[PDB]
PDB file of C-alpha atoms and ligand atoms in Angstrom:
ATOM      1  CA  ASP A   1     133.853   5.300  84.434  1.00 40.99           C
ATOM      2  CA  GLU A   2     134.910   8.988  84.264  1.00 39.32           C
ATOM      3  CA  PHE A   3     138.401  10.472  84.177  1.00 40.79           C
ATOM      4  CA  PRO A   4     139.219  14.053  85.225  1.00 40.81           C
ATOM      5  CA  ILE A   5     141.046  16.367  82.855  1.00 41.08           C
ATOM      6  CA  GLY A   6     142.403  18.180  85.862  1.00 40.04           C
ATOM      7  CA  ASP A   7     141.240  19.693  89.084  1.00 42.69           C
ATOM      8  CA  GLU A   8     137.861  21.402  89.215  1.00 38.98           C
ATOM      9  CA  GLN A   9     138.006  25.197  88.872  1.00 36.46           C
ATOM     10  CA  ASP A  10     135.864  28.165  89.921  1.00 36.22           C
ATOM     11  CA  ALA A  11     135.453  31.030  87.478  1.00 39.21           C
ATOM     12  CA  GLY A  12     132.969  33.816  88.106  1.00 34.45           C
ATOM     13  CA  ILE A  13     129.656  32.327  89.189  1.00 33.82           C
ATOM     14  CA  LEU A  14     130.571  28.959  87.611  1.00 33.18           C
ATOM     15  CA  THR A  15     132.160  25.784  88.920  1.00 35.93           C
ATOM     16  CA  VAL A  16     133.745  23.985  85.975  1.00 33.26           C
ATOM     17  CA  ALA A  17     134.884  20.358  85.944  1.00 31.03           C
ATOM     18  CA  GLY A  18     136.308  18.701  82.855  1.00 33.65           C
ATOM     19  CA  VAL A  19     136.127  14.929  82.396  1.00 30.88           C
ATOM     20  CA  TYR A  20     136.567  12.393  79.617  1.00 30.00           C
ATOM     21  CA  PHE A  21     135.627   8.769  78.994  1.00 31.01           C
ATOM     22  CA  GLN A  22     134.875   6.440  76.064  1.00 30.68           C
ATOM     23  CA  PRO A  23     133.259   7.977  72.951  1.00 31.49           C
ATOM     24  CA  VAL A  24     129.466   7.781  72.990  1.00 28.68           C
ATOM     25  CA  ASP A  25     126.453   7.411  70.721  1.00 30.96           C
ATOM     26  CA  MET A  26     124.265  10.556  70.824  1.00 29.06           C
ATOM     27  CA  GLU A  27     120.652  11.030  69.687  1.00 29.23           C
ATOM     28  CA  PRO A  28     120.341  13.174  67.592  1.00 29.25           C
ATOM     29  CA  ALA A  29     123.984  12.895  66.455  1.00 26.52           C
ATOM     30  CA  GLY A  30     124.771  16.579  66.974  1.00 26.57           C
ATOM     31  CA  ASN A  31     127.895  18.289  65.656  1.00 28.09           C
ATOM     32  CA  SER A  32     130.677  16.075  66.979  1.00 27.71           C
ATOM     33  CA  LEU A  33     132.371  12.934  65.684  1.00 29.40           C
ATOM     34  CA  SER A  34     130.685   9.569  65.520  1.00 30.76           C
ATOM     35  CA  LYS A  35     131.550   7.087  68.248  1.00 27.33           C
ATOM     36  CA  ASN A  36     133.731   4.965  65.967  1.00 30.09           C
ATOM     37  CA  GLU A  37     135.635   8.003  64.633  1.00 30.06           C
ATOM     38  CA  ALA A  38     136.446   9.533  68.037  1.00 31.05           C
ATOM     39  CA  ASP A  39     139.121   9.041  70.714  1.00 33.23           C
ATOM     40  CA  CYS A  40     136.941   9.997  73.681  1.00 36.61           C
ATOM     41  CA  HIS A  41     133.944  11.874  74.905  1.00 35.12           C
ATOM     42  CA  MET A  42     134.908  15.179  76.530  1.00 35.74           C
ATOM     43  CA  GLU A  43     132.542  16.893  78.912  1.00 36.50           C
ATOM     44  CA  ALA A  44     132.309  20.213  80.742  1.00 35.03           C
ATOM     45  CA  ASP A  45     130.376  19.836  84.014  1.00 35.31           C
ATOM     46  CA  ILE A  46     129.215  23.396  84.665  1.00 31.16           C
ATOM     47  CA  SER A  47     127.311  24.328  87.808  1.00 29.27           C
ATOM     48  CA  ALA A  48     126.604  27.487  89.763  1.00 29.47           C
ATOM     49  CA  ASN A  49     128.698  28.227  92.817  1.00 31.12           C
ATOM     50  CA  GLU A  50     127.681  30.477  95.717  1.00 32.88           C
ATOM     51  CA  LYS A  51     128.127  33.693  93.718  1.00 34.65           C
ATOM     52  CA  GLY A  52     125.527  32.421  91.233  1.00 38.31           C
ATOM     53  CA  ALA A  53     122.674  33.465  93.528  1.00 38.70           C
ATOM     54  CA  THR A  54     123.266  37.014  92.218  1.00 37.20           C
ATOM     55  CA  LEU A  55     121.781  35.773  88.920  1.00 39.49           C
ATOM     56  CA  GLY A  56     119.092  33.584  90.494  1.00 38.99           C
ATOM     57  CA  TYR A  57     120.946  30.238  90.398  1.00 38.14           C
ATOM     58  CA  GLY A  58     120.908  27.778  93.268  1.00 38.74           C
ATOM     59  CA  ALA A  59     124.355  26.598  94.288  1.00 38.27           C
ATOM     60  CA  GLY A  60     125.224  23.349  92.515  1.00 36.89           C
ATOM     61  CA  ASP A  61     122.583  23.858  89.813  1.00 35.97           C
ATOM     62  CA  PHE A  62     123.405  23.017  86.188  1.00 35.13           C
ATOM     63  CA  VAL A  63     123.713  26.257  84.215  1.00 39.44           C
ATOM     64  CA  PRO A  64     121.928  25.789  80.859  1.00 38.10           C
ATOM     65  CA  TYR A  65     121.940  27.873  77.656  1.00 37.58           C
ATOM     66  CA  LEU A  66     125.678  28.542  77.791  1.00 34.04           C
ATOM     67  CA  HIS A  67     127.846  28.348  74.683  1.00 36.12           C
ATOM     68  CA  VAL A  68     130.853  26.165  75.395  1.00 33.33           C
ATOM     69  CA  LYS A  69     133.822  25.529  73.139  1.00 31.98           C
ATOM     70  CA  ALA A  70     137.003  23.585  73.816  1.00 31.74           C
ATOM     71  CA  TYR A  71     140.435  24.457  72.467  1.00 28.15           C
ATOM     72  CA  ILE A  72     142.848  21.513  72.302  1.00 30.57           C
ATOM     73  CA  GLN A  73     146.517  22.244  71.609  1.00 32.93           C
ATOM     74  CA  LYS A  74     149.371  19.758  71.548  1.00 32.82           C
ATOM     75  CA  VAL A  75     152.102  21.232  73.718  1.00 34.14           C
ATOM     76  CA  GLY A  76     154.781  22.797  71.530  1.00 36.42           C
ATOM     77  CA  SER A  77     152.482  22.717  68.480  1.00 33.00           C
ATOM     78  CA  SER A  78     151.614  25.679  66.266  1.00 31.43           C
ATOM     79  CA  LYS A  79     147.971  24.612  65.774  1.00 32.53           C
ATOM     80  CA  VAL A  80     144.859  24.503  67.946  1.00 30.73           C
ATOM     81  CA  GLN A  81     141.783  22.327  67.435  1.00 31.63           C
ATOM     82  CA  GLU A  82     138.434  24.000  68.227  1.00 32.84           C
ATOM     83  CA  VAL A  83     135.484  21.793  69.246  1.00 31.40           C
ATOM     84  CA  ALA A  84     131.955  23.053  69.894  1.00 29.09           C
ATOM     85  CA  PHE A  85     130.212  21.389  72.820  1.00 30.41           C
ATOM     86  CA  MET A  86     126.485  20.740  72.878  1.00 33.38           C
ATOM     87  CA  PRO A  87     124.129  20.374  75.862  1.00 33.92           C
ATOM     88  CA  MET A  88     123.009  16.828  76.502  1.00 34.11           C
ATOM     89  CA  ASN A  89     121.959  14.289  79.072  1.00 32.30           C
ATOM     90  CA  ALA A  90     123.842  11.149  79.982  1.00 29.88           C
ATOM     91  CA  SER A  91     122.822   8.638  82.650  1.00 30.26           C
ATOM     92  CA  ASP A  92     124.659  10.925  85.125  1.00 32.48           C
ATOM     93  CA  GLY A  93     122.709  14.039  84.134  1.00 29.88           C
ATOM     94  CA  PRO A  94     123.071  17.245  82.134  1.00 31.49           C
ATOM     95  CA  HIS A  95     126.381  18.511  80.789  1.00 29.42           C
ATOM     96  CA  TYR A  96     128.061  20.089  77.774  1.00 30.12           C
ATOM     97  CA  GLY A  97     130.041  17.603  75.722  1.00 34.16           C
ATOM     98  CA  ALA A  98     131.351  16.337  72.426  1.00 34.22           C
ATOM     99  CA  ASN A  99     133.056  13.316  70.969  1.00 34.22           C
ATOM    100  CA  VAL A 100     136.663  14.369  70.403  1.00 35.23           C
ATOM    101  CA  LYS A 101     139.669  13.157  68.409  1.00 36.32           C
ATOM    102  CA  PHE A 102     143.156  14.180  69.517  1.00 39.27           C
ATOM    103  CA  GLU A 103     144.588  15.118  66.149  1.00 37.94           C
ATOM    104  CA  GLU A 104     148.267  14.898  67.151  1.00 40.11           C
ATOM    105  CA  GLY A 105     148.077  11.433  68.736  1.00 41.60           C
ATOM    106  CA  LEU A 106     149.076  10.329  72.200  1.00 42.36           C
ATOM    107  CA  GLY A 107     150.877  13.017  74.158  1.00 45.08           C
ATOM    108  CA  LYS A 108     150.714  16.155  76.280  1.00 42.59           C
ATOM    109  CA  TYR A 109     147.968  18.701  75.532  1.00 44.63           C
ATOM    110  CA  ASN A 110     146.696  22.014  76.849  1.00 47.19           C
ATOM    111  CA  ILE A 111     142.873  22.005  77.166  1.00 46.85           C
ATOM    112  CA  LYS A 112     140.839  25.225  77.430  1.00 45.22           C
ATOM    113  CA  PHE A 113     137.065  25.592  77.884  1.00 47.63           C
ATOM    114  CA  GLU A 114     135.624  28.917  76.644  1.00 47.37           C
ATOM    115  CA  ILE A 115     132.201  29.569  78.209  1.00 48.42           C
ATOM    116  CA  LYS A 116     129.955  32.319  76.806  1.00 50.47           C
ATOM    117  CA  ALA A 117     126.863  33.596  78.610  1.00 48.42           C
ATOM    118  CA  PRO A 118     123.362  32.817  77.294  1.00 50.51           C
ATOM    119  CA  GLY A 119     122.761  36.080  75.446  1.00 49.29           C
ATOM    120  CA  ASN A 120     119.335  36.692  73.918  1.00 50.32           C
ATOM    121  CA  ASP A 121     118.178  33.099  74.593  1.00 50.67           C
ATOM    122  CA  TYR A 122     117.856  33.350  78.388  1.00 48.55           C
ATOM    123  CA  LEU A 123     116.250  36.383  80.055  1.00 44.49           C
ATOM    124  CA  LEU A 124     116.749  37.911  83.502  1.00 43.54           C
ATOM    125  CA  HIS A 125     114.081  39.577  85.620  1.00 41.77           C
ATOM    126  CA  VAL A 126     115.682  42.951  86.493  1.00 40.18           C
ATOM    127  CA  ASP A 127     112.831  44.787  88.257  1.00 40.05           C
ATOM    128  CA  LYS A 128     113.379  45.337  91.974  1.00 41.30           C
ATOM    129  CA  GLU A 129     110.340  43.324  93.092  1.00 43.31           C
ATOM    130  CA  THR A 130     111.148  39.970  91.372  1.00 47.70           C
ATOM    131  CA  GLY A 131     114.531  40.582  89.761  1.00 48.64           C
ATOM    132  CA  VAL A 132     118.140  39.593  90.260  1.00 50.00           C
ATOM    133  CA  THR A 133     120.930  42.043  91.075  1.00 51.26           C
ATOM    134  CA  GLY A 134     123.631  40.497  88.888  1.00 47.55           C
ATOM    135  CA  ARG A 135     124.191  40.508  85.148  1.00 48.55           C
ATOM    136  CA  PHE A 136     125.692  37.880  82.861  1.00 52.48           C
ATOM    137  CA  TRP A 137     129.397  38.056  82.098  1.00 51.11           C
ATOM    138  CA  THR A 138     130.353  39.898  78.917  1.00 51.43           C
ATOM    139  CA  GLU A 139     133.791  38.414  78.359  1.00 51.29           C
ATOM    140  CA  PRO A 140     133.889  34.636  77.783  1.00 51.99           C
ATOM    141  CA  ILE A 141     135.005  32.704  80.832  1.00 55.22           C
ATOM    142  CA  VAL A 142     138.169  30.654  80.212  1.00 53.10           C
ATOM    143  CA  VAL A 143     139.185  27.585  82.227  1.00 51.58           C
ATOM    144  CA  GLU A 144     142.495  25.986  81.281  1.00 49.07           C
ATOM    145  CA  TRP A 145     144.242  22.753  82.233  1.00 47.51           C
ATOM    146  CA  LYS A 146     147.913  22.499  81.345  1.00 45.01           C
ATOM    147  CA  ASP A 147     149.820  19.225  80.890  1.00 45.61           C
ATOM    148  CA  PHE A 148     146.846  16.945  80.271  1.00 47.32           C
ATOM    149  CA  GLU A 149     148.297  13.605  79.075  1.00 48.76           C
ATOM    150  CA  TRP A 150     146.272  11.703  76.486  1.00 45.98           C
ATOM    151  CA  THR A 151     147.531   8.111  76.693  1.00 48.52           C
ATOM    152  CA  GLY A 152     144.797   6.380  74.724  1.00 48.51           C
ATOM    153  CA  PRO A 153     141.740   4.561  76.036  1.00 48.72           C
ATOM    154  CA  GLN A 154     141.546   3.694  79.738  1.00 50.69           C
ATOM    155  CA  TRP A 155     138.419   1.593  79.266  1.00 49.36           C
TER     156      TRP A 155
ATOM    157  CA  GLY B   1     110.273  36.687  98.266  1.00 45.59           C
ATOM    158  CA  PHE B   2     107.426  38.096  96.192  1.00 46.34           C
ATOM    159  CA  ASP B   3     103.712  37.336  95.961  1.00 44.96           C
ATOM    160  CA  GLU B   4     102.779  34.548  93.523  1.00 42.52           C
ATOM    161  CA  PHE B   5      99.214  33.654  92.554  1.00 40.60           C
ATOM    162  CA  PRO B   6      98.113  30.155  91.514  1.00 39.82           C
ATOM    163  CA  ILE B   7      96.909  28.905  88.167  1.00 38.82           C
ATOM    164  CA  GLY B   8      95.123  25.821  89.407  1.00 40.67           C
ATOM    165  CA  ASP B   9      97.086  22.902  90.866  1.00 40.00           C
ATOM    166  CA  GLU B  10     100.443  21.334  89.992  1.00 38.34           C
ATOM    167  CA  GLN B  11     100.095  18.625  87.324  1.00 34.81           C
ATOM    168  CA  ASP B  12     102.247  15.701  86.184  1.00 35.17           C
ATOM    169  CA  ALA B  13     102.549  14.855  82.483  1.00 32.53           C
ATOM    170  CA  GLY B  14     105.050  12.316  81.208  1.00 34.61           C
ATOM    171  CA  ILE B  15     108.364  12.966  82.993  1.00 31.12           C
ATOM    172  CA  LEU B  16     107.378  16.569  83.815  1.00 26.08           C
ATOM    173  CA  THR B  17     105.864  18.239  86.853  1.00 22.52           C
ATOM    174  CA  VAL B  18     104.182  21.465  85.713  1.00 20.25           C
ATOM    175  CA  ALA B  19     102.775  24.305  87.818  1.00 20.54           C
ATOM    176  CA  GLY B  20     101.427  27.678  86.700  1.00 19.02           C
ATOM    177  CA  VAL B  21     101.619  30.962  88.598  1.00 17.46           C
ATOM    178  CA  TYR B  22     101.207  34.619  87.803  1.00 17.87           C
ATOM    179  CA  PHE B  23     102.138  37.888  89.473  1.00 19.19           C
ATOM    180  CA  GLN B  24     102.778  41.532  88.621  1.00 20.39           C
ATOM    181  CA  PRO B  25     104.367  42.163  85.193  1.00 17.55           C
ATOM    182  CA  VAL B  26     108.153  42.310  85.221  1.00 18.82           C
ATOM    183  CA  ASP B  27     111.100  43.950  83.452  1.00 18.52           C
ATOM    184  CA  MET B  28     113.191  41.468  81.473  1.00 18.37           C
ATOM    185  CA  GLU B  29     116.725  41.947  80.133  1.00 15.37           C
ATOM    186  CA  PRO B  30     116.768  41.538  77.151  1.00 16.17           C
ATOM    187  CA  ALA B  31     113.031  42.206  76.617  1.00 17.63           C
ATOM    188  CA  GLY B  32     112.267  39.008  74.745  1.00 17.21           C
ATOM    189  CA  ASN B  33     109.100  38.433  72.776  1.00 16.70           C
ATOM    190  CA  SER B  34     106.500  39.349  75.356  1.00 18.93           C
ATOM    191  CA  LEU B  35     104.772  42.596  76.325  1.00 20.67           C
ATOM    192  CA  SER B  36     106.543  45.334  78.229  1.00 21.45           C
ATOM    193  CA  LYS B  37     105.955  45.716  81.951  1.00 19.62           C
ATOM    194  CA  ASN B  38     103.558  48.616  81.543  1.00 16.50           C
ATOM    195  CA  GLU B  39     101.495  47.049  78.730  1.00 14.85           C
ATOM    196  CA  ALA B  40     100.784  43.670  80.375  1.00 17.09           C
ATOM    197  CA  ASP B  41      98.260  42.417  82.914  1.00 16.48           C
ATOM    198  CA  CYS B  42     100.608  39.962  84.554  1.00 15.15           C
ATOM    199  CA  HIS B  43     103.745  37.920  84.301  1.00 17.22           C
ATOM    200  CA  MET B  44     102.795  34.279  83.775  1.00 19.32           C
ATOM    201  CA  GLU B  45     105.213  31.510  84.683  1.00 17.48           C
ATOM    202  CA  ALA B  46     105.409  27.784  83.942  1.00 17.05           C
ATOM    203  CA  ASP B  47     107.455  25.929  86.557  1.00 15.76           C
ATOM    204  CA  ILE B  48     108.582  22.754  84.826  1.00 14.45           C
ATOM    205  CA  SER B  49     110.666  20.182  86.642  1.00 14.92           C
ATOM    206  CA  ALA B  50     111.478  16.490  86.293  1.00 16.06           C
ATOM    207  CA  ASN B  51     109.348  14.059  88.314  1.00 15.58           C
ATOM    208  CA  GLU B  52     110.505  10.571  89.357  1.00 17.60           C
ATOM    209  CA  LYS B  53     110.042   9.296  85.806  1.00 18.72           C
ATOM    210  CA  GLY B  54     112.547  11.883  84.552  1.00 15.70           C
ATOM    211  CA  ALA B  55     115.383   9.608  85.661  1.00 16.20           C
ATOM    212  CA  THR B  56     114.723   7.566  82.483  1.00 16.75           C
ATOM    213  CA  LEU B  57     116.137  10.574  80.578  1.00 20.30           C
ATOM    214  CA  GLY B  58     118.916  11.228  83.092  1.00 20.16           C
ATOM    215  CA  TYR B  59     117.242  14.102  84.980  1.00 16.85           C
ATOM    216  CA  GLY B  60     117.410  14.352  88.765  1.00 13.93           C
ATOM    217  CA  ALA B  61     114.021  14.507  90.474  1.00 13.17           C
ATOM    218  CA  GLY B  62     112.862  18.066  91.006  1.00 14.43           C
ATOM    219  CA  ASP B  63     115.448  19.661  88.714  1.00 13.35           C
ATOM    220  CA  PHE B  64     114.596  22.331  86.158  1.00 11.29           C
ATOM    221  CA  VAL B  65     114.152  20.954  82.629  1.00 12.65           C
ATOM    222  CA  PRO B  66     115.806  23.379  80.178  1.00 11.40           C
ATOM    223  CA  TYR B  67     115.709  23.680  76.359  1.00 12.77           C
ATOM    224  CA  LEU B  68     111.965  23.055  76.190  1.00 12.64           C
ATOM    225  CA  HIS B  69     109.777  25.145  73.878  1.00 12.90           C
ATOM    226  CA  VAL B  70     106.799  26.358  75.880  1.00 12.79           C
ATOM    227  CA  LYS B  71     103.774  28.176  74.516  1.00 14.06           C
ATOM    228  CA  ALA B  72     100.656  29.270  76.378  1.00 15.18           C
ATOM    229  CA  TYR B  73      97.195  29.213  74.791  1.00 15.70           C
ATOM    230  CA  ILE B  74      94.653  31.366  76.629  1.00 16.89           C
ATOM    231  CA  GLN B  75      91.007  31.155  75.613  1.00 18.59           C
ATOM    232  CA  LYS B  76      88.086  32.974  77.204  1.00 17.42           C
ATOM    233  CA  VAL B  77      85.440  30.351  77.943  1.00 16.83           C
ATOM    234  CA  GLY B  78      82.572  30.664  75.489  1.00 20.42           C
ATOM    235  CA  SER B  79      84.800  32.501  72.990  1.00 19.85           C
ATOM    236  CA  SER B  80      86.386  31.269  69.781  1.00 17.87           C
ATOM    237  CA  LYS B  81      89.379  33.608  70.248  1.00 16.34           C
ATOM    238  CA  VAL B  82      92.589  31.909  71.427  1.00 16.71           C
ATOM    239  CA  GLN B  83      95.622  33.988  72.373  1.00 18.67           C
ATOM    240  CA  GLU B  84      99.017  32.350  71.862  1.00 20.05           C
ATOM    241  CA  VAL B  85     102.109  33.553  73.737  1.00 23.50           C
ATOM    242  CA  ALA B  86     105.546  31.975  73.566  1.00 26.74           C
ATOM    243  CA  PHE B  87     107.302  31.665  76.896  1.00 26.90           C
ATOM    244  CA  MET B  88     111.000  32.093  77.200  1.00 24.15           C
ATOM    245  CA  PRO B  89     113.459  30.589  79.699  1.00 24.18           C
ATOM    246  CA  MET B  90     114.660  33.092  82.276  1.00 24.16           C
ATOM    247  CA  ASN B  91     115.789  33.614  85.866  1.00 27.08           C
ATOM    248  CA  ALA B  92     113.939  35.534  88.563  1.00 29.58           C
ATOM    249  CA  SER B  93     115.015  35.871  92.195  1.00 32.79           C
ATOM    250  CA  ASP B  94     113.351  32.478  92.764  1.00 33.71           C
ATOM    251  CA  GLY B  95     115.277  30.756  89.973  1.00 32.43           C
ATOM    252  CA  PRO B  96     114.729  29.452  86.458  1.00 32.31           C
ATOM    253  CA  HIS B  97     111.366  29.188  84.787  1.00 32.81           C
ATOM    254  CA  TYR B  98     109.587  29.681  81.500  1.00 33.56           C
ATOM    255  CA  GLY B  99     107.484  32.820  81.367  1.00 31.06           C
ATOM    256  CA  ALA B 100     106.104  35.862  79.600  1.00 29.89           C
ATOM    257  CA  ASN B 101     104.303  39.099  80.372  1.00 27.17           C
ATOM    258  CA  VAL B 102     100.718  38.514  79.211  1.00 29.63           C
ATOM    259  CA  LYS B 103      97.442  40.406  78.683  1.00 26.98           C
ATOM    260  CA  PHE B 104      94.014  38.835  79.280  1.00 23.97           C
ATOM    261  CA  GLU B 105      92.526  40.239  76.084  1.00 25.67           C
ATOM    262  CA  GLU B 106      88.864  39.531  76.876  1.00 25.66           C
ATOM    263  CA  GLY B 107      88.800  41.015  80.349  1.00 26.58           C
ATOM    264  CA  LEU B 108      87.719  39.575  83.662  1.00 23.42           C
ATOM    265  CA  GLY B 109      86.280  36.089  83.890  1.00 22.39           C
ATOM    266  CA  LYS B 110      86.828  32.433  83.019  1.00 22.84           C
ATOM    267  CA  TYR B 111      89.693  31.297  80.782  1.00 20.44           C
ATOM    268  CA  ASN B 112      91.065  27.942  79.709  1.00 21.51           C
ATOM    269  CA  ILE B 113      94.836  28.054  80.089  1.00 21.74           C
ATOM    270  CA  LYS B 114      96.948  25.499  78.204  1.00 21.36           C
ATOM    271  CA  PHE B 115     100.741  25.120  78.346  1.00 23.86           C
ATOM    272  CA  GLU B 116     102.070  23.332  75.242  1.00 23.21           C
ATOM    273  CA  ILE B 117     105.502  21.887  75.983  1.00 23.82           C
ATOM    274  CA  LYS B 118     107.639  20.823  73.021  1.00 25.61           C
ATOM    275  CA  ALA B 119     110.680  18.620  73.548  1.00 27.76           C
ATOM    276  CA  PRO B 120     114.120  20.135  72.816  1.00 31.20           C
ATOM    277  CA  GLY B 121     114.586  18.525  69.395  1.00 30.53           C
ATOM    278  CA  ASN B 122     118.016  19.140  67.876  1.00 30.31           C
ATOM    279  CA  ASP B 123     118.871  21.569  70.733  1.00 28.27           C
ATOM    280  CA  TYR B 124     119.604  18.876  73.322  1.00 27.96           C
ATOM    281  CA  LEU B 125     121.197  15.480  72.817  1.00 26.31           C
ATOM    282  CA  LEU B 126     120.863  12.177  74.658  1.00 27.54           C
ATOM    283  CA  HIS B 127     123.645   9.652  75.171  1.00 28.07           C
ATOM    284  CA  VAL B 128     122.038   6.414  73.945  1.00 29.46           C
ATOM    285  CA  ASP B 129     124.919   3.951  74.232  1.00 27.31           C
ATOM    286  CA  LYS B 130     124.480   1.176  76.796  1.00 26.23           C
ATOM    287  CA  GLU B 131     127.409   2.196  78.980  1.00 26.55           C
ATOM    288  CA  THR B 132     126.774   5.926  79.545  1.00 27.83           C
ATOM    289  CA  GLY B 133     123.358   6.365  77.956  1.00 25.27           C
ATOM    290  CA  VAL B 134     119.683   6.539  78.838  1.00 22.66           C
ATOM    291  CA  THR B 135     116.801   4.363  77.677  1.00 18.87           C
ATOM    292  CA  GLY B 136     114.079   7.020  77.855  1.00 20.38           C
ATOM    293  CA  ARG B 137     113.306   9.205  74.864  1.00 21.92           C
ATOM    294  CA  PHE B 138     111.775  12.645  74.257  1.00 23.99           C
ATOM    295  CA  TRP B 139     108.169  13.081  73.116  1.00 25.90           C
ATOM    296  CA  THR B 140     107.325  13.641  69.440  1.00 25.04           C
ATOM    297  CA  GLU B 141     104.242  15.685  69.974  1.00 20.76           C
ATOM    298  CA  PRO B 142     104.003  18.441  72.627  1.00 21.73           C
ATOM    299  CA  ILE B 143     103.007  17.606  76.181  1.00 21.06           C
ATOM    300  CA  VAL B 144      99.865  19.585  77.011  1.00 19.88           C
ATOM    301  CA  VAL B 145      98.836  20.725  80.498  1.00 20.34           C
ATOM    302  CA  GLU B 146      95.531  22.539  80.935  1.00 19.47           C
ATOM    303  CA  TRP B 147      93.592  24.316  83.651  1.00 23.49           C
ATOM    304  CA  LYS B 148      89.954  24.844  82.678  1.00 21.69           C
ATOM    305  CA  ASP B 149      87.906  27.751  84.084  1.00 22.63           C
ATOM    306  CA  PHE B 150      90.848  29.619  85.582  1.00 18.98           C
ATOM    307  CA  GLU B 151      89.393  32.898  86.874  1.00 17.49           C
ATOM    308  CA  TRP B 152      91.108  36.163  85.934  1.00 15.85           C
ATOM    309  CA  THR B 153      89.957  38.471  88.722  1.00 19.18           C
ATOM    310  CA  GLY B 154      92.308  41.412  88.195  1.00 21.63           C
ATOM    311  CA  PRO B 155      95.567  42.618  89.736  1.00 21.69           C
ATOM    312  CA  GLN B 156      96.008  42.475  93.489  1.00 20.02           C
ATOM    313  CA  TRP B 157      99.199  44.562  93.327  1.00 19.07           C
TER     314      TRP B 157
HETATM  315 CU1   CU C 201     127.928  14.065  76.486  1.00 17.09          CU
HETATM  316 CU1   CU C 202     109.748  35.258  84.128  1.00 17.68          CU
END
């Protein structure tokens, strides 16, 4: 069903897995390509690790209200494709994802996920009685997988 | 880790399990839409999670349901005045919830408290293909949960 982009990675309070599988139909359609126009669905599985308790997250919890963008670059190429992910549910639960088309065809790509904190959408209790001790990250978190091979559908 | 006071009993509505609590007003960063700590009577919280029926939408039982739009309507019983207060999603030491600092504008006594829970709309997508998708669908009109004759008795803190 699901194919890893690479090994799972910890970054700050986040645990970030990247997977891909067949392109999907989404309701509403969102920002990404239609199923027939796409090569795959790409998905960032983002959850809190143990350090997330500093912001009030339980370990393993989905972290919502993030802003996630993927950068897809053919190795040796002068151009990078930028793809906004949206939050969504599949049968396997919440994630950030998008239908994606590899613009340079089958080959070796570098894949980066850029993960921005919630900002003014999501609040934090900061008082001592009920509050958390941590604060959201200010610089976007970057997870990168080198030498991902896109070899067409595996489904 | 801190004292929480009940608004009635936990209620199920659609795929949601909804409980209300309140406690001392809090400091929020950023401040959001609601009253400041020193201007409010309490912090009011809606704890919204998926029940067993939430699996139809791909939610795990008990998990927080994000991207909802939650508003509270607070009406003193016998009064025509209805206060409306938007809740925002946020984390406290006990985890995610929707909440706001609120003021009971008509003083001590009986209030009807309604939580109006709008579905995410264009903010949250659903896979709907057969292979990876879900067969449940979000609600067009808000889910409403109400506790009648909640008693505001003043701060214990
Ligand atoms: Cu998806
Ligand atoms: Cu709160």
